[PDB]
């Protein structure tokens, strides 16, 4: 199953919480948040568009670091 890696402008724990809330409301996702490195790793059959649009709902700078 595709593992997408994203960069999110998370400055503290409450940003990581904001990230989980939006990703939870999305559903169909297993996810991993690395706060010190400002990274979010997402196991999902969801398209990159959807994941990107979802993460951007937080109001924060989001970019795509790619896949594996």
Indicate the annotated binding residues for Cu cation: 12, 15
User: Would you tell me the crossing angle of helices 13-26 and 48-56 to the nearest 10 degrees?
Assistant: 130
Tell me which stretch binds Ag ion (CB under 5 A): 8-16, 22-30, 35-43, 49-57. 8-16
| C-alpha span between 13 and 45 (Å, rounded) | 27
Q: CB of residue 33 vs Ag ion: minimum separation in angstroms?
A: 12
Give dist(CA 36, CA 55) in Å, integer.
18
Site string for Ag ion, 12-31 (x = CB under 5 A): x-xx----------------
Per the DSSP assignment, residues forming a β-bridge with 3 are 43
Sign of the C-alpha dihedral computed for residues 32, 9, 50 and 53 taken in this order: positive
> How many binding residues for Ag ion (CB under 5 A)?
4
| Closest distance to Ag ion from the beta carbon of 17 (Å) | 7
The residue ranges that bind Ag ion (CB under 5 A) are 11-12, 14-15
């Amino acid at each position: 199953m595709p593992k997408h890696e994203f960069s999110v402008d998370m400055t503290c724990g409450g940003c990581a919480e904001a990230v989980s809330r939006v990703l939870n409301k999305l559903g169909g996702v297993k996810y991993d948040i690395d706060l010190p490195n400002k990274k979010v790793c997402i196991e999902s059959e969801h398209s990159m568009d959807t994941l990107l649009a979802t993460l951007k709902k937080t109001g924060k700078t989001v970019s795509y670091l790619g896949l594996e």
